[PDB]
Nucleic acid binder design. Structure first.
Length: 78
DNA sequence: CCTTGGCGGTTTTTTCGCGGGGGTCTGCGCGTTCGTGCGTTTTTGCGGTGCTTGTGCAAAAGAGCGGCCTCGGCACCGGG
């Protein structure tokens, strides 16, 4: 379901960054880099959860993993 | 305080970037049809109470009996 990140949505995301024109081949590249980033953060959150002896990933594990990667997130109980 | 290799100014050379010009194609813009998301109400699962099913802990007398012992009576060893 990587195709679920649809073309208008990624167009909107590029548009927030101030981009005027979009190449036709860029969408697969953005899907790939988003997959890589999500893979890394999800992996770290999952092993945090497995150390915590839990079966449900909470928001704290996600914020912890992100802050450990230098991508500190405010607003979710950090 | 000694030393010398290298920065620095100067003069030739050489070469890459930008602009102009041109051409091409491809995302952008808009219209039409289709999908599949958020929003509700319904369904299945986890739990508790109440009810039902299992089960541990007074002489007296006779009759009959087993063990037993004396005894009867016999066969047998030793010798000729």
């Amino acid at each position: 379901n990587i195709q679920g990140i649809t073309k208008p949505a990624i167009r909107r995301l590029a548009r927030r960054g101030g981009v005027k024109r979009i190449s036709g081949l860029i969408y697969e590249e953005t899907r790939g880099v988003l997959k890589v980033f999500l893979e890394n953060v999800i992996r770290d959150a999952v092993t945090y959860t497995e150390h915590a002896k839990r079966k449900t990933v909470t928001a704290m594990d996600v914020v912890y993993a992100l802050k450990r990667q230098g991508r500190t997130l405010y607003g979710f109980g950090g």
